Design a protein around this ligand. Structure first.
Ligand SMILES: CC(=O)N[C@H]1[C@H]([C@H](O)[C@H](O)CO)O[C@@](O)(C(=O)O)C[C@@H]1O
Ligand SMILES: CC(=O)N[C@H]1[C@H]([C@H](O)[C@H](O)CO)O[C@@](O)(C(=O)O)C[C@@H]1O
Ligand SMILES: [Ca+2]
Ligand SMILES: [Ca+2]
Ligand SMILES: [Ca+2]
Ligand SMILES: [Ca+2]
Ligand SMILES: [Ca+2]
Ligand SMILES: [Ca+2]
Ligand SMILES: [Ca+2]
Ligand SMILES: [Ca+2]
Ligand SMILES: [Cl-]
Ligand SMILES: [Cl-]
Ligand SMILES: [Cl-]
Ligand SMILES: [Cl-]
Ligand SMILES: [Cl-]
Ligand SMILES: [Cl-]
Ligand SMILES: [Cl-]
Ligand SMILES: [Cl-]
Ligand SMILES: [Cl-]
Ligand SMILES: [Cl-]
Ligand SMILES: [Cl-]
Ligand SMILES: [Cl-]
Ligand SMILES: [Mg+2]
Lengths: 281, 264, 234, 57, 281, 57, 48, 57, 48, 27
């Protein structure tokens, strides 16, 4: 299937007036060039292949950067650097988010890919053996780790991936896991109805998708015990929606995001650069 | 004889006429309908109140002036205290509904102005404090039939507790997108030289078959002056805009005692 | 084992690759689909929807609702009413339309562009307006007598409220680039009073029209890319 | 269970796919779907509008 | 299909004179040996397989050498060493360019391959963990990075390849991406028409293909944060045209290039070495 | 979808190809094309020239 | 997995190799070809 | 000896298995077995109980 | 050897993977099964 | 094989009493 070819047409002198319409109806303009000019025949062999939803979304996009370290931790703060937990979301970054938010609802499977990098913290503390990483998906309700070597990492039921530094970026597919019939990118509502004269707090409650979304937690550790040399690591998380369907198009985000909601920032709500004059080519 | 400008709509015991319409929109080309067995979820026999609730309810009118920046409502919120629809809504945990929305605004052949009338699924709006995100109170999010108004200035609150309302900034559609692109949503325009009404028929739209009406608004209704009202003999004149909405194919599940939401 | 030999590319992560991968949640039972209104299959469906050009984004009106309405009056000036280049991805006014936003995820575009104008004066206002598209390579038109030598339509104001002017696909290259670029310049769109707007007494003598842009069915885009319209601090 | 399909053409014609995994979520990208119906967004009107006719009669 | 076999022929005494022609016509000489000598029959089984365009161009050729580094950068100049950008072209080197320029127009898909190498900058600063590289293709219009760790590298839509040092040279195919129906290797013209009495500058404008070509930008970084040991890297970029068609042959480049155009250099326009005499075997 | 073709002969005969990718740009080299028509460059003349005849008559 | 065993040559980059590789721009719609005069198929055409 | 079977459905349909090893213990997971008989635990009674009838008569 | 190219995921240990692997006790003769009362097939049987 | 679908049913006024049982039976 191709885009529209142009038919051979000449001129008209007619009570048929395709150049006029009334957009009050809610219909967009419909006229094409053959309606308002003399056209030659042009066969159009070009296709809209690269603007299908699958093509538009068919990329692994970075959605967050996590940090973990491996060293002999002697304080509570340093013990917490030996592993990390991250609430799974696409709102830490802006690029994939904005593309998804052309739509109100979506349904897709996910390809997740990870890029893991290290550096030496210092050079006077010897070296470090090659590190193995554990990335554990903790669905809502499953126990979250409080230390890098607690019982949760045995991961009898949670899916974990063990990645060996220097090997190919690890990768797995996730099905469409939504508890509704599609994912909602926007939710105009609340998680509960506050009722007349109840004592529950109404002053610090939130609004929208953040009150109802929960895709679980990614927990990451280095499996190795500490070397004399402290190693610091970054884990970049990539998402590619595949087998995609979307519904109910929206205007795209026009101004910077300032969090997980639709809120905007007072110093950043002037996207247009003014033109010198209405007659500026 | 028949004309794109002249229409009658009857639902239940209520009828609307217009003699200066401009066709009618059926959002996404889909008429509302009842929930099929092959797409159903809650298993209790639903209540389908039919004519008691599926009828035109007329909201309080608002005044269009040369300085107006626009108006918004949410649905089913705007109808929550409307006759038997409101009662059925609050006696049940779950509800779904389509709508016929009829926006009314007449003037004269010497007035000018144009209103964009948009039906927006999941019309999530920005909050009015930069100390928090997504920080809007239930009461401010759900004003009922009075709806709210847009502004052309954004002045977020000094303290988080004072900014728990929508920052309904007109040119960003109250949600960080440019208003000129709102036409991707089902819409009509009331351009005073052409027409005096807009009619939009809306199916139920959600990522679920049925949902909690008291928690969740499925549609926003936005009326924005695209071209300001002007009238040469009196530039400070006001003309009413009246919004009349009928639920359609309403269906409710999970009957119990009545929901009475917080009011402050 | 089966003798194999690794080729270049082995172990790389190409972000536009298209491979299978093991499922982390095997035998998961996805929520059954139901019909939801408004399904979209192609971004070009969205490009065919009219959105408003912020045509009057001058100082004091840019980033306000007043950036959209195009000023008109009953004075019959010979000055153009508006003038804009056919650069739908990169122009300061076209780039933020729905079409412009979609184009900024692509590198190449082709096809015809539809400009639809809605007159929003009173019913008592009459007028004739010339809308023109001049393909590039000559003096940009600043007078009606130059504009009318190009592709154009004379719009008579009346009961039918709206008029559509086409910028038909007229290009040397098979695609134009979604950036400001001399080689793939698109030409000039202008507008003049053909007669003038006339009103009787007791009627506003100044008023507005709205300009919309959309893609035609001959329109397509290529070469996915990141947009310059969104960013974040690091 | 090999699927043989047409490739997207290049500068100057089939390819083969076998699914290795028991979950469809593991599969490569969906095949090109050229479906479209712009009119649900560009012309969602109750009464048919013929271009050559007046929009308002 | 083989090259031409030679038929058995003897002599002639004839008004047929294939030895004479008139090259004023624009025809090259056509006569073959059987026309002017006595020949034996020789069956020719040899083929022109290796001089087809696909065979002539069927090699990955180095087209540029890029440099990137990874160290703790404290100045603007050193921050700019943490990533590099390169306007994609075949004119940084001469060998592939000269071969392509036997032709005026071409159409081909491209295989791109990369060879990535490192060395230690110094030896008194410890060591460095194995590095991952990102090579991002930035099509014209997409935002270009201003720092090695800015938002552009999330690459939601641009294609990127992540390469792990020591792994096989990375490789990808690129379709024929020209906006015309073929690539032009030569363009006798300008990007715009300068018009009578315009105020636009005409004193510093350029000519030819450089005024109209734009194949985008390759951006490269090391993804890892800095180690105590500074690592410097080279990325060699290789191109192989495949599925090749070409049109309108040209004399090959006879003298050194001095830039992206056809310009020549005054001290290097004497390719022939003079012979002692016209009679020198 | 396996293609079986003749190999280029060596010192002293078929090979198999399967395309793994959905884009033809991903494919290996085009098969040997022995097409040629030197006369479009060596003899691009309007009126036929017979070798044995005088070039100019 | 299918048991396999790597042979000599594994991971090398031979510049005259002839392998498939993934496309960086999947489902790209190439500009349609048109007839251009003067197509060349073999360098020996030029040698004549 | 390739086995072609239905995949578990995803967001939006067959896969192929070949066993490489001579021991069945080496095989991948058993195919989905939807067998069940809850009544051996929920109703292990000697005399049939009809729901609509009295449990004790 | 057959030309191959490693993809992302190569060498990872995903704990929910489902691959074949070589048997450490080849040609082992398992104890024959007998019928045992109370076989369970699904955790939902227990939930009922 | 799927989990149990729910049939369309209305009300009853009947000597059939599925709401009562006797779990002493072990059922
Ligand atoms: C992350 C970072 O900046 N690390 C730097 C360290 C640490 O600052 C100190 O060793 C801590 O005591 O110092 C170095 O001189 C070193 O050890 O070789 C350089 C190294 O890059
Ligand atoms: C690129 C280069 O030439 N590097 C050289 C360095 C640097 O010049 C200094 O270390 C900078 O201070 O010096 C060496 O003696 C060293 O450190 O072992 C040898 C090394 O090859
Ligand atoms: Ca015509
Ligand atoms: Ca066509
Ligand atoms: Ca009923
Ligand atoms: Ca019409
Ligand atoms: Ca002879
Ligand atoms: Ca021969
Ligand atoms: Ca002769
Ligand atoms: Ca009973
Ligand atoms: Cl463990
Ligand atoms: Cl260890
Ligand atoms: Cl300007
Ligand atoms: Cl109310
Ligand atoms: Cl209250
Ligand atoms: Cl073996
Ligand atoms: Cl301004
Ligand atoms: Cl990044
Ligand atoms: Cl790092
Ligand atoms: Cl000599
Ligand atoms: Cl396996
Ligand atoms: Cl072999
Ligand atoms: Mg009321």
């Amino acid at each position: 299937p191709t885009a529209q070819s142009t038919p051979l047409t000449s001129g008209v002198n007619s009570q048929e007036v395709p150049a006029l319409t009334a957009v009050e109806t809610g219909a967009s303009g419909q006229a094409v060039p053959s309606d308002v000019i003399e056209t030659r025949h042009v066969v159009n062999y070009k296709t809209r292949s690269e603007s299908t939803l699958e093509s538009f979304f068919g990329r692994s996009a970075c959605v967050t950067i996590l940090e973990v370290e491996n060293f002999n931790a002697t304080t509570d703060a340093d013990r917490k650097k030996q592993f990390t937990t991250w609430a799974i979301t696409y709102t830490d970054t802006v690029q994939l988010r904005r593309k998804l938010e052309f739509f109100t609802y979506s349904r897709f499977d996910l390809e997740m890919t990870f890029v893991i990098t290290e550096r030496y913290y210092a050079s006077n503390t010897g070296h470090a053996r090659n590190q193995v990483y554990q990335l554990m998906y903790i669905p809502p309700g499953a126990p979250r780790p409080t230390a890098w070597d607690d019982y949760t990492w045995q991961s009898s039921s949670n899916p974990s991936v063990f990645y060996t530094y220097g090997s190919a970026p690890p990768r797995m597919s996730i099905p469409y896991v939504g508890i509704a019939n599609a994912y909602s990118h926007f939710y105009d509502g609340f998680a509960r109805v506050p009722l007349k004269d109840e004592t529950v707090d109404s002053g610090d409650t939130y609004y929208g998708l953040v009150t109802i979304n929960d895709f679980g937690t990614l927990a990451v550790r280095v499996v190795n015990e500490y070397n004399p040399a402290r190693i610091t690591s970054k884990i970049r998380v990539y998402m590619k929606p595949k087998h995609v369907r979307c519904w109910c198009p929206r205007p795209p985000r026009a101004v910077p995001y300032r969090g997980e909601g639709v809120d905007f920032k007072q110093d950043s709500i002037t996207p247009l650069t003014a033109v010198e004059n209405i007659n500026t080519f | 004889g028949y004309s794109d400008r002249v229409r009658q709509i009857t639902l239940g015991n209520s009828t609307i006429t217009t003699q200066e319409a401009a066709n009618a929109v059926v959002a996404y080309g889909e008429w509302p309908s009842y929930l099929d067995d092959k797409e159903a979820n809650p298993i209790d026999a639903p209540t389908e109140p039919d004519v008691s609730s599926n009828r035109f309810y007329t909201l309080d009118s608002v005044q269009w002036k040369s300085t107006s920046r626009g108006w918004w409502w949410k649905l089913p919120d705007a109808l929550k205290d409307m006759g038997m629809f409101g009662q059925n809504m609050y006696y049940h945990y779950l509800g779904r509904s389509g709508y016929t929305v009829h926006v009314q605004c007449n003037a004269s052949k010497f007035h000018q102005g144009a209103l964009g009338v948009f039906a927006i699924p999941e019309y999530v709006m920005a909050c009015n404090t930069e100390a928090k995100t997504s920080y809007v109170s239930y009461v401010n999010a759900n004003p009922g039939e009075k709806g709210g108004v847009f502004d052309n200035a954004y002045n977020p609150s000094a303290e988080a507790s004072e900014g728990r309302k929508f920052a309904a900034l007109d040119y960003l559609l109250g949600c960080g997108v440019l208003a000129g692109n709102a036409f991707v949503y089902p819409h009509q325009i009331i351009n005073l030289r052409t027409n005096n009404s807009a009619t939009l028929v809306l199916p139920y739209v959600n990522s679920l078959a049925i949902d909690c009406m008291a928690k969740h608004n499925n549609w926003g209704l936005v009326i924005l002056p695209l071209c300001k009202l002007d009238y040469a003999p009196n530039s400070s004149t006001e003309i009413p805009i009246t919004v009349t909405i009928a639920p359609m194919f309403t269906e409710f599940n999970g009957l119990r005692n009545i929901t009475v939401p917080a009011t402050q | 084992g089966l003798p194999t030999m690794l080729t270049p590319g082995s172990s790389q992560f190409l972000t536009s690759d298209d491979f299978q991968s093991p499922c982390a949640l095997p035998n998961f039972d996805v929520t059954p689909p139901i019909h939801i209104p408004g399904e979209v299959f192609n971004m070009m469906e969205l490009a065919e929807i009219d959105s408003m050009i912020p045509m009057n984004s001058v100082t004091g009106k840019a980033n306000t609702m007043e950036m959209y309405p195009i000023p008109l009056d009953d004075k019959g000036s010979a000055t153009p009413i508006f003038s804009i280049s056919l650069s739908p991805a990169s122009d300061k006014r076209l780039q933020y339309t729905m079409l412009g936003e979609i184009l900024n995820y692509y590198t190449h575009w082709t096809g015809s562009l539809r400009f639809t104008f809605l007159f929003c004066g009173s019913m008592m206002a009459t007028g004739k307006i010339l809308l023109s598209y001049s393909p590039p390579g000559a003096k940009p038109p600043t007078t009606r007598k130059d504009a009318m030598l190009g592709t154009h339509i004379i719009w008579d104001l009346g009961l039918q409220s709206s008029c559509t002017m086409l910028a038909p696909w007229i290009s040397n290259t098979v695609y134009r680039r979604c950036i400001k670029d001399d080689f793939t310049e698109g030409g000039y769109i202008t507008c003049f009073y053909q007669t003038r707007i006339v009103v009787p007494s007791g009627t506003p003598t100044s008023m507005f029209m709205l300009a919309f842009v959309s893609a035609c069915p001959d329109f397509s885009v290529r070469l996915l890319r990141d947009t310059n319209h969104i960013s974040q601090r690091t | 269970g090999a699927q043989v399909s047409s490739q997207k053409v290049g500068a100057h014609v089939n390819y083969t796919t076998i699914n290795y995994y028991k979950d469809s979520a593991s599969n490569a990208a969906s095949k090109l779907d050229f479906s479209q119906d712009p009119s649900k967004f560009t012309e969602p009107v109750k009464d048919i509008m013929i271009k050559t006719a007046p929009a308002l009669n």
